[PDB]
Amino acid sequence: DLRRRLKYFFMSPCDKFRAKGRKPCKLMLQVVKILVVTVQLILFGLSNQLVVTFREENTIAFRHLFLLGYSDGSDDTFAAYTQEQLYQAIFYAVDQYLILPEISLGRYAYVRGGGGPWANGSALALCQRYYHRGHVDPANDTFDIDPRVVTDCIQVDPPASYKNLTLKFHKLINVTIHFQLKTINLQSLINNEIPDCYTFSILITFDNKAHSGRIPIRLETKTHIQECKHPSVSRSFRLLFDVVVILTCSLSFLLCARSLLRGFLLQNEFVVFMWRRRGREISLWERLEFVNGWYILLVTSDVLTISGTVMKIGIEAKNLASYDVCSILLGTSTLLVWVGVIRYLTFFHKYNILIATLRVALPSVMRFCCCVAVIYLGYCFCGWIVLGPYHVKFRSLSMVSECLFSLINGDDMFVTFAAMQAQQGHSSLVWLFSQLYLYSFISLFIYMVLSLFIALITGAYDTIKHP
Amino acid sequence: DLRRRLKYFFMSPCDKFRAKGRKPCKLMLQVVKILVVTVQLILFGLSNQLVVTFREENTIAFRHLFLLGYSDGSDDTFAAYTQEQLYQAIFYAVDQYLILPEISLGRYAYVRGGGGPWANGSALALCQRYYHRGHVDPANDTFDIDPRVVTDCIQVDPPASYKNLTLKFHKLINVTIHFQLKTINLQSLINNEIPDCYTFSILITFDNKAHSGRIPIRLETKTHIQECKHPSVSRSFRLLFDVVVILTCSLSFLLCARSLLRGFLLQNEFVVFMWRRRGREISLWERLEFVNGWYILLVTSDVLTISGTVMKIGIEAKNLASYDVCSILLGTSTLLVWVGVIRYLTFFHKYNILIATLRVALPSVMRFCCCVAVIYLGYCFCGWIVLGPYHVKFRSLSMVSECLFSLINGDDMFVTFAAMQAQQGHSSLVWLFSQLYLYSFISLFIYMVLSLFIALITGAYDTIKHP
Amino acid sequence: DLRRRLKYFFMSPCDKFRAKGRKPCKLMLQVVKILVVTVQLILFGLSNQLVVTFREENTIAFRHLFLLGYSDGSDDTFAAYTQEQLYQAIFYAVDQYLILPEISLGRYAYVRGGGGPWANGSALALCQRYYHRGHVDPANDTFDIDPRVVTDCIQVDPPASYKNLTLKFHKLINVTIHFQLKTINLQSLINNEIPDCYTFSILITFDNKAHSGRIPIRLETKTHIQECKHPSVSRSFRLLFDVVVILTCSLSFLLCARSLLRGFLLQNEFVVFMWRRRGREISLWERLEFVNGWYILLVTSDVLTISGTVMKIGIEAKNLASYDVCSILLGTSTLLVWVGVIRYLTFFHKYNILIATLRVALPSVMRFCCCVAVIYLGYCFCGWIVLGPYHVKFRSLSMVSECLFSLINGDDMFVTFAAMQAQQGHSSLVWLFSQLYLYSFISLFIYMVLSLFIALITGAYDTIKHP
Amino acid sequence: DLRRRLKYFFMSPCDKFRAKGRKPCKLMLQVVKILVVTVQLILFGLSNQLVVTFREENTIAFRHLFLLGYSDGSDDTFAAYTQEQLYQAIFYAVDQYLILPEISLGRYAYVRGGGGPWANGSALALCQRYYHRGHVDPANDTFDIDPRVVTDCIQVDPPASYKNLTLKFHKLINVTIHFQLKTINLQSLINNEIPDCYTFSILITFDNKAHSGRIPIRLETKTHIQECKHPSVSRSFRLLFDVVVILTCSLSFLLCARSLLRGFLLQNEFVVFMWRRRGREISLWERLEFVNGWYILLVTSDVLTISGTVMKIGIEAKNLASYDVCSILLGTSTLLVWVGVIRYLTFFHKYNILIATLRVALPSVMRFCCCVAVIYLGYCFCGWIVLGPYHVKFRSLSMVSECLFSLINGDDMFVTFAAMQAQQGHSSLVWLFSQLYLYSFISLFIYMVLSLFIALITGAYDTIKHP
Ligand SMILES: *[C@@H]1O[C@H](CO)[C@@H](O[C@@H]2O[C@H](CO)[C@@H](O)[C@H](O)[C@H]2NC(C)=O)[C@H](O)[C@H]1NC(C)=O
Ligand SMILES: *[C@@H]1O[C@H](CO)[C@@H](O[C@@H]2O[C@H](CO)[C@@H](O)[C@H](O)[C@H]2NC(C)=O)[C@H](O)[C@H]1NC(C)=O
Ligand SMILES: C[C@H]1CC(C)(C)N(C(=O)CN2C(=O)c3ccccc3C2=O)c2ccccc21
Ligand SMILES: C[C@H]1CC(C)(C)N(C(=O)CN2C(=O)c3ccccc3C2=O)c2ccccc21
Ligand SMILES: C[C@H]1CC(C)(C)N(C(=O)CN2C(=O)c3ccccc3C2=O)c2ccccc21
Ligand SMILES: C[C@H]1CC(C)(C)N(C(=O)CN2C(=O)c3ccccc3C2=O)c2ccccc21
Ligand code: NA
Ligand code: NA
DSSP states (O other): OOOHHHHHHTOOHHHHHHHHOOOOHHHHHHHHHHHHHHHHHHHHHHHHHHHHHHHHHHHHHHHHHHSTTOOTTOTTTOEEOBHHHHHHHHHHHHHHHHHHHHHBSSOOEEOTTTTOTTSSSOSEEEEEEEEEEEOOBGGGTBOOEEEEEEEEEEEEOOOOGGGGOOOOGGGEEEEEEEEEEEEEOGGGGGGTOOOOEEEEEEEEEEEOTTOSSOEEEEEEEEEEEEOOSBOOBOOOOHHHHHHHHHHHHHHHHHHHHHHHHHHHHHHHHHHHHHHHHSOSSOOSHHHHHTSOHHHHHHHHHHHHHHHHHHHHHHHHTTSOOOHHHHHHHHHHHHHHHHHHGGGGGSSSTTSOHHHHHHHHHHHHHHHHHHHHHHHHHHHHHHHHHHHTTTOGGGSSHHHHHHHHHHHHTTOSHHHHHHHHHHHGGGSHHHHHHHHHHHHHHHHIIIIIIHHHHHHHHHHHHHHHSOO | OOOHHHHHHTOOHHHHHHHHOOOOHHHHHHHHHHHHHHHHHHHHHHHHHHHHHHHHHHHHHHHHHHSTTOOTTOTTTOEEOBHHHHHHHHHHHHHHHHHHHHHBSSOOEEOTTTTOTTSSSOSEEEEEEEEEEEOOBGGGTBOOEEEEEEEEEEEEOOOOGGGGOOOOGGGEEEEEEEEEEEEEOGGGGGGTOOOOEEEEEEEEEEEOTTOSSOEEEEEEEEEEEEOOSBOOBOOOOHHHHHHHHHHHHHHHHHHHHHHHHHHHHHHHHHHHHHHHHSOSSOOSHHHHHTSOHHHHHHHHHHHHHHHHHHHHHHHHTTSOOOHHHHHHHHHHHHHHHHHHGGGGGSSSTTSOHHHHHHHHHHHHHHHHHHHHHHHHHHHHHHHHHHHTTTOGGGSSHHHHHHHHHHHHTTOSHHHHHHHHHHHGGGSHHHHHHHHHHHHHHHHIIIIIIHHHHHHHHHHHHHHHSOO | OOOHHHHHHTOOHHHHHHHHOOOOHHHHHHHHHHHHHHHHHHHHHHHHHHHHHHHHHHHHHHHHHHSTTOOTTOTTTOEEOBHHHHHHHHHHHHHHHHHHHHHBSSOOEEOTTTTOTTSSSOSEEEEEEEEEEEOOBGGGTBOOEEEEEEEEEEEEOOOOGGGGOOOOGGGEEEEEEEEEEEEEOGGGGGGTOOOOEEEEEEEEEEEOTTOSSOEEEEEEEEEEEEOOSBOOBOOOOHHHHHHHHHHHHHHHHHHHHHHHHHHHHHHHHHHHHHHHHSOSSOOSHHHHHTSOHHHHHHHHHHHHHHHHHHHHHHHHTTSOOOHHHHHHHHHHHHHHHHHHGGGGGSSSTTSOHHHHHHHHHHHHHHHHHHHHHHHHHHHHHHHHHHHTTTOGGGSSHHHHHHHHHHHHTTOSHHHHHHHHHHHGGGSHHHHHHHHHHHHHHHHIIIIIIHHHHHHHHHHHHHHHSOO | OOOHHHHHHTOOHHHHHHHHOOOOHHHHHHHHHHHHHHHHHHHHHHHHHHHHHHHHHHHHHHHHHHSTTOOTTOTTTOEEOBHHHHHHHHHHHHHHHHHHHHHBSSOOEEOTTTTOTTSSSOSEEEEEEEEEEEOOBGGGTBOOEEEEEEEEEEEEOOOOGGGGOOOOGGGEEEEEEEEEEEEEOGGGGGGTOOOOEEEEEEEEEEEOTTOSSOEEEEEEEEEEEEOOSBOOBOOOOHHHHHHHHHHHHHHHHHHHHHHHHHHHHHHHHHHHHHHHHSOSSOOSHHHHHTSOHHHHHHHHHHHHHHHHHHHHHHHHTTSOOOHHHHHHHHHHHHHHHHHHGGGGGSSSTTSOHHHHHHHHHHHHHHHHHHHHHHHHHHHHHHHHHHHTTTOGGGSSHHHHHHHHHHHHTTOSHHHHHHHHHHHGGGSHHHHHHHHHHHHHHHHIIIIIIHHHHHHHHHHHHHHHSOO
């Protein structure tokens, strides 16, 4: 019961081969797997980029075609301030829709019945929504509101009545123009793909929910991709390459599972042996240590890779169009595959500084982060509610977190101060509070929190560095 | 006189319970208090954001309605350079005021007698201010000025004479157009609130105080919020939740006060005992140490929370409209409540690195800051007066401080240099001085001051870290 | 010969008083001197800001009055691309000059004979400069140039011939329009000052020196300030306060000189004594050490303060108008006065960390900087010549230095890369070189140079810190 | 066999002279070489800047002359959205070309036969490219495409038919307008150079490859520089100075080669001696160490300098016009020459901190970088494919690398987050992935990777610092 096997288990592939004539199959697979997974990622990215561009470019074209006086870059300030301006914008949108085929550079088809729920079979719906009862009378400081929402729709069919529109401004909530357009993404031919049919759902909103004398106007689109009914192109190895990637990932999965099982059985044998030699129920954290975390990482990376590859095959077969989910799966798998090659550098301590440090430092780092997180969250909520109405970088919780995290790393500091300087928070009290808030957060987190964090990490390194 | 009580006083809640069967009431209150205070903060923020948006959006609408040729973003460069331009801008403002009801998207009411002190009961006042005597004659290098200010006002009433305005350009100081508009913030219905009446005081200024051939034009508003006289909405737990928050905070206050008193009495007993056993008047800094700073922090946090909650109740009852003060109170209380939970991590030294370091390092840090502050203030004053006229980031003292503080953290460096590069300070001497100023400040504070500060903090950490 | 005097010389003011009943006159002067110098700086800054604003605002007004189609912010791209555009711009400038009094918001006077050297007594000179001989014939790839510059001027007098202007485009070098305007800076009355007469020399340049089909157009001004011949204002302590500042600075100067002399005499006595007791010519660096550098700093600060104060008196007396030099003197003196108060913190080692560190670290820091400076200068020259034509941040040597210095501190990195990304240097070779240049400079200086610099500074601190 | 020669070999120039009366010729050459190489670099930069400006300014002029409604700064958003807009832009370009001589401020000559391959001897070619067969019918979800590209060109000759252009929009790929213009860079006379003939190849592209309803329009130029056939200027030491630089560099090369040979021979002699005294084949890494890396650096720097100087002579002689390659050679040589002077500071250890540290730290640094590079590359590929379609900073691989490298140094953090905030990736899944990606990358690389890197560098410094 010398158990030299337990010695051969924790052996570098070079030592595993000098000792037992064992070809490093897993090491060779990783390099080939890295190459094939990265190549597959790039190949998918070609068509993914084509799709995203098509959607974005069409949206910009719609904004230039339907939004009166639209100019690039003014998406957040585009608004109407006069009754005449609002009427002109609405009528311009409808008129441009009605003459689209004669003007548009793209080849768009109308969608009969695409006007939405309010379009009773019409292509375009022009809905205005107002309170059921509204009697705003600021002169007498009096109002009488029935906040029930009434929807009034005008049906527009491509080849008028919509010109007779009268807007109830004093109680208007919003006006919307819903219509759908069909077009074919021909550019996919460059990738030797068959073009799909894209249906864009276009929603133009004139938003008066604030009743503030300023009515923002925006255009939004939703895209639906589907195979064309009758495609004909007079014109690859992509499917074969995806099958190859699946083969490599399946082989690596099999090898990793076999190694994990062998390690678990060795753990059981060792544990029962130590129970014989010394006392029983003696090993605990060690039973855990008998596992290889890198083999778990590889197993989960190749599972993600197989899922992404199957999804890529489905998208190319036109069974599904979820390019975002597939791109995310393939990119995460590529990153994990690149990371996995560090497993073979963990044997030589000269190249293993990063991982050894991480292993030593993570418990203290997590204990530190526990304390630092409550302070961070308190600051986040405080800033979000107090400064969010006044500060453009504190509008939402995620935005506040991004702002504070970038401030911790010394980024965009003066711009953060200047945002409050420019408007003074329309209240010296808010400005003074922002001064105290920003100075205290920056000083605390840059000089104490970050200094202590770094000190913990470098202390862990000093612990693993032999000197 | 073993005084195991003095042992039970400085005990962790887990130890306080394993020893005396004591339920950690304060620990449980903190979590519940955290939750309820944060929820209340968010709930208040809903309506606070509604109010701030209403004010800002109305101001933008006014700028588009009354400022001739106004475009978004040009607030600091909007100005007139010709007599005709100034006349056209003034007359455009008045004309737009006179036809407001027919054009405005918002529902505004005039305010008869709102023209201000210069409007003798008129709705709009159009005042021009000029020197009592002014005989500027640059051709003969001669002038004769009586700098007494004369105000001449034209009364405008909504349904002319103001068209006959003649401006004394050579001695004009400024022209102002004061009027008031009433509107109802209907959007508050989404929060199940009763809309208020907002009165906006609008002041348009054509400023010629510089006599420089360029007359900046700006629009400012003041807002006054009050309950409507006759509201009617055909349509919550907010008051009940505020009462709940008050209950939790009052209970925590009571517990903290009771604990503080118990600790003070224990301090007195211990001190008199040590006076018996050893010499008299022996304890000093220790008598102080017998206090818990966290219980003081909790007491002041719940006082702030109660004040903010009462103010929130008042605002919802429409007894007052001070959303900024209430928001500041609630946000500060939320931050303090989140911070207070670290009290229970100060018992375990593994999680107490930050606080222990702070405690060890603050005296040396403050002694260092004493010296660093005089240098910083000297630089601040120097930059403010020498570079403020030429540099857009040195305009005011607070702006100079923000600039220098962000420079210490390496932020917006090149933009700071480039501001002086672009104009060269219209004097090579000023440019050279700015070069020396910026290089010396940046080098000194980034490489010496900050290095020494960090070294002090990490030295304190090394002192409390057991290794 | 116990020389307790040499003990009393190196004594803190508190010790100097507990020992010899000596009131700390210098310590009290520093605080009062700080206060009065800062107040004087601010008071001067009021009028300095007024002057600078006047100049800048007038320049902007001129650009809007004389530059056809000018709009704020387009100062670097404002240019003509067509013969008609150039003619229209020139004629617009002249026409606006000719009707200035009827349109300008400022009160400007013409200057008869102000047209410059080319104006033979005329108010406006419109000069075009072209080669004496120019026969550019790109069709035959032939030219014949006599690069002698010929100046042709048209005289314009305010109440035509200039309308008959014909420009020799193929050989045109530039066109210039020179004229002068007089105006009175009335706003100075707010500071209770007598307004001065400002003469602006306006130069409009249509620059064709590049012969590139694009003719940049710019407006420049020079300002000359002088007292008005016949001022009359129907309407301070500033002179008295300046005399007070001079008094305080002179007293401090006297005390510092007396102390420096006493220290030098004590040095001589000690040195000769040590020559008696021990060998002769034994002391060297110590003779130097017997001097107080802070007393030298104070002496030079109060000299600067007196010079600045006398200059301020001169400017207020209207004997001179050099606000930039005076502002620089007063600001430097204010900074030095604030710094000087650290002298009294150098006695207590707890507050003297910064200065003691600096003293220990400066030799090693300077030896390090010697080596780092040659690398920095090599990079500066390389970047300036190779990348300056393509990169907007490398245009000039000072700009290159600012760019590299800010890069060392991690500032504006991505913008620096993106500048080269956007144009690709119109040559992949230049882009690749810029990649190597930026990556190598950033990596070297951030990770090695700065790390070593900080290590030297903190090592010096470790040397002076008692632990 | 005392071999004091081996002692005299590793001797500082001061010691080499105190011992053997040896004038430090190489040390003196370095200073003179530094001066002359830097001066030559600046002198070349004069003309290099002239050339680059000429090209850029002409390109901007062309964009203003030929692109309808072009305005500065809108290069990436300039596009057509309507059939009428596209026709107007095309016809405007052609019309402006046809009347160029009467309008252009520059003196341009037509190039007969310069229209390109599609111009059969014509000056201007106006080509439209469309699919051989295209039957896009989105209404029936059907298409029939023959993706063969058909080119149809219209020949335009300067002093119509091109007005009869009909564009097949449904199958249009792109339209291009190719023409050439000749002009003379007269500004070179300021450098006392003979102006060259520049031929600009202008390509205007209306790109419809995306078929997205938006057709970007761009103008590109290629420049060809050649000597004029018949130049005549009625009008330096540059060639003499270049010969001087060549002389200095050749002398330094000779001295460095002689020293390298002497060192190699000394290595051989020492090695064979040690083989006699002690065992044979004993020295290995030492034989390598017997070489001076600085002499290799100097040799390669002066080789680069000579190549650049010869190229500069060629360009001035008009035998070649490759200013970019010459500028790169001269700038790299200047940087290397400045760096080379550190060789004489490597003798004194007080000034040799940087180099000694680098020498000690490079092996550990490289081992660390090996591990860090796979993680970095994985992140780069992941970001490039997943976020590149949505994020403007992830468009290309080089751009992704610049973004991640600047993020490591804490640069442009909040802007990176905000880019994804603004559009939300049009998919909450993409936004969430970007959040995880950015947070994980920033945290890992700033807090662990960079901390460990710095710790390695400062540890190497601690190893070479005597304390
Ligand atoms: C226009 O206003 C109506 C009514 O205010 C909005 O309709 C609501 O939409 C939300 C989310 O789509 C639903 O949860 C509600 O049930 C709808 N009705 C009400 C009474 O709230 C509509 O969303 C607005 N349109 C746009 C484009 O914003
Ligand atoms: C227009 O100019 C007048 C006179 O210069 C300003 O009136 C002064 O305003 C300040 C602050 O409001 C008061 O302290 C003064 O008493 C007022 N009179 C004088 C003679 O100074 C007025 O503020 C200016 N208007 C605007 C909108 O700036
Ligand atoms: C960002 C990382 C590093 C460290 C220590 C600087 N740190 C904080 O400073 C506080 N803190 C958060 O709570 C947090 C939560 C989500 C995003 C970013 C942060 C964030 O910056 C922290 C705290 C908890 C978890 C991770 C971290
Ligand atoms: C900002 C904090 C950290 C530290 C040490 C970097 N530090 C300085 O560098 C000098 N300094 C001021 O005087 C100061 C005053 C107000 C705002 C910011 C500052 C500021 O940056 C300082 C000095 C005094 C009090 C606090 C601090
Ligand atoms: C800026 C300071 C700090 C330090 C060490 C970072 N450092 C360099 O990195 C190289 N370096 C110059 O040569 C230099 C010269 C002029 C302005 C800025 C610099 C500059 O950044 C340097 C070198 C010489 C003198 C001062 C310094
Ligand atoms: C930039 C230098 C310093 C250091 C250690 C921070 N480091 C990384 O963090 C990872 N890393 C790359 O892989 C890399 C490759 C190309 C450009 C920039 C980088 C880059 O930032 C790295 C890694 C390999 C080679 C050089 C370096
Ligand atoms: Na930055
Ligand atoms: Na930074």
